[PDB]
């Protein structure tokens, strides 16, 4: 019966450089014409020099980023503290997504 | 015999080590109980063994209230008595929930009898050494005493006695029931039945008893109640002031 899921705003912009990369994001979190926060970013540095933002609906976002942080933790644990690459991180984030396509 | 303690096999004797020793060990608490039925009441009187001054004299119990009508005295070690008490309490309530009718004595006897038989059949549970004396004034069966013994054997009794001094008590009940020519007490008021009971108990066990040496549970039609310290005293008082 209920679907509480809808969408909320926010905007991010990612640019790849030669030797660098940026991931820029606003701090405004909204639901409709109300301000939820003025200071809260949807962008987090998730570590190993991987930065992430799962922009859109907050409820989904917060939960995907809690899931990705534990997964990063266990990788490290089991695999000799190995660097999480942008390639590895990527694959993992897909497996989480397709886990909840249902 | 057989070798029942190492594998669950039979004995050519028919009766196994688990059954044979359950018949024995049911007294080591130095306990004696009797149950008599009135015309229209049922009375249980039981020894109460408060052996210390570190214990409250009314947390020591051996008579349990299983239902609102039904009482059960367990003659056995106290862990085994509570193991039986817990199971009996659920079965009594579950029977009322499903079948819409409170538990009678005989059906509780049967359930437990079947359980005790199964744990003797198993090699993965121990059976208990408990003799369960179930009592009530049932609505259809009248005044009732049904006593189970360990084996998973049970049968209905006129009146009964339990404890090492079973024999002493028996000869007094026999003598009364022949004299009167009925297998219940002519009396019909639970006070006078309680008073009578104690009389035959003093006589059998050879010591005059106090209230803290007795514990009384009374069954009547549609209610079960336990008698308190003052309540026991009132009965005792008369037996001490008549010849």
């Amino acid at each position: 019966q209920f679907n509480p899921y809808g969408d909320n705003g926010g905007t991010i912009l990612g640019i790849a450089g030669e030797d660098f990369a940026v991931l820029a994001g606003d701090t405004r979190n909204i639901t409709d014409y109300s301000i939820n926060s003025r200071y809260e970013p949807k962008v987090f540095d998730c570590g190993d020099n991987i930065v992430m933002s799962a922009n859109g609906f907050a409820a989904d976002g917060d939960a995907l980023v809690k899931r990705f942080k534990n997964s990063v933790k266990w990788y490290h644990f089991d695999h000799n503290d190995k660097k999480l690459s942008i390639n590895s991180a990527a694959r993992n984030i897909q497996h989480l997504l397709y886990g909840k396509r249902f | 015999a057989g070798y029942d303690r190492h594998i669950t096999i039979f004995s050519p004797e028919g009766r196994l080590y688990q059954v044979e020793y359950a018949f024995k060990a049911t007294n080591q608490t130095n306990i004696n109980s009797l149950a008599v039925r009135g015309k229209d009441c049922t009375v249980v009187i039981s020894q109460k063994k408060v052996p210390d001054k570190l214990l409250d004299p009314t947390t020591v119990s051996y008579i349990f209230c299983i239902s609102r009508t039904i009482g059960m005295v367990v003659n056995g070690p106290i862990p085994d008595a509570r193991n039986a008490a817990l199971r009996a309490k659920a079965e009594a309530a579950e029977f009322r929930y499903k079948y819409g009718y409170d538990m009678p004595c005989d059906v509780l006897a049967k359930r437990m009898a079947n359980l005790s038989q199964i744990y003797t059949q198993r090699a993965y549970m121990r059976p208990l050494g408990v003799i369960l004396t179930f009592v009530s004034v049932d609505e259809e069966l009248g005044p009732s005493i049904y006593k189970t013994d360990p084996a998973g054997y049970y049968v209905g009794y006129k009146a009964t006695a339990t404890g090492p001094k079973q024999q002493e008590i028996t000869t007094n009940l026999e003598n009364h029931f022949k004299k009167s020519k009925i297998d219940h007490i002519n009396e019909e008021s639970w006070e006078k039945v309680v008073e009578f009971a104690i009389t035959h108990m003093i006589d059998a066990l050879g010591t005059e008893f106090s209230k803290n040496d007795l514990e009384v549970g009374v069954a009547t039609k549609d209610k079960f109640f336990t008698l308190s310290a003052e309540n026991i005293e009132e009965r005792l008082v008369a037996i001490a002031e008549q010849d």
């Binding site: - | 029942d4 303690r5 190492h6 669950t8 080590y17 688990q18 020793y21 359950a22 024995k24 060990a25 080591q28 001054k53 570190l54 214990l55 409250d56 947390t59 020591v60 070690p77 106290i78 862990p79 509570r82 193991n83 817990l86 198993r122 090699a123 993965y124 549970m125 121990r126 059976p127 208990l128 050494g129």
Partner: protein, 245 residues
């Protein structure tokens, strides 16, 4: 070696299997704990043995709460005690959620009690071997209960156990007899300290650390608390007074 010492999938000729008998014997060579029932509360105390200067004072505790108003201390085998309590918690919480009330002490007792009995009817599942002195206050008074290895429990008004049991029980009954039940909760703290101090005389090849707690209806306002600060210094004072010092 009879299968009455290697299995509990049978009844014994002594009405108990040897290993359960042995649990009772191992409580007694152990550590001393008491419990004092009083007319408005209960008081707990336990002797914590000092074997090195490497131990820290009161950052290892033996009295552990269940709920917030029932205090549990136990003597005997350490692992068995953790497991008993963990269970004790799951019952207590289930009761609070389900009936919307803190759990009664005769109720709480039946729930732990049935679980100690369970582990004593299987041929490969370890018995418990702790004696637990526990209790607290509820809406018809204070209650002191003591739980044994074998699944045996009754209500107590005074209770004692351990190495120094004999001594402890002697002082403890004298004081309980003298009093209506135990007098005030406050008086009982000092008294409790004397028993534990007195029991320590039975083992002077080690030191102790006196640890007391209480749970009292109007003298803790329904809660179980540790006994500390002034209240611990005072009980010490009283103790070293009588047992010379």
């Amino acid at each position: 070696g009879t299968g009455y010492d290697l299995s509990n999938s049978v009844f014994s000729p002594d009405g108990r299997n040897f290993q359960v008998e042995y649990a009772v014997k191992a409580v007694e060579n152990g550590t001393t704990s008491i419990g004092i029932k009083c007319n408005d509360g209960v008081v707990f105390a336990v002797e914590k043995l000092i074997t090195s200067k490497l131990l820290v004072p009161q950052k290892n505790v033996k009295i552990q709460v269940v709920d917030r108003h029932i205090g549990c201390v136990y003597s005997g085998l350490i692992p068995d005690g953790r497991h008993l309590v963990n269970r004790g918690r799951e019952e207590a919480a289930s009761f609070k959620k389900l009936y919307k009330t803190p759990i009664p002490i005769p109720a709480f007792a039946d729930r732990l009690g049935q679980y100690v009995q369970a582990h004593t009817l299987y041929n490969s599942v370890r018995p418990f071997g702790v004696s637990t002195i526990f209790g607290g206050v509820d809406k018809n008074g204070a209650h002191l209960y003591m739980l044994e290895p074998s699944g045996s429990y009754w209500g107590y008004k005074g209770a004692a156990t351990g190495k120094g049991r004999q001594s402890a029980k002697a002082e403890l009954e004298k004081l309980v007899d003298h009093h209506p039940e135990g007098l005030s909760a406050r008086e009982a703290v000092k008294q409790a300290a004397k028993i534990i101090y007195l029991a320590h005389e039975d083992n002077k090849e080690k030191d102790f650390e006196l640890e007391i707690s209480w749970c009292s209806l109007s003298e803790t306002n329904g809660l179980h608390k540790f006994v500390k600060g002034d209240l611990l210094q005072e009980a010490i004072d009283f103790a070293q007074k009588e047992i010379n010092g």
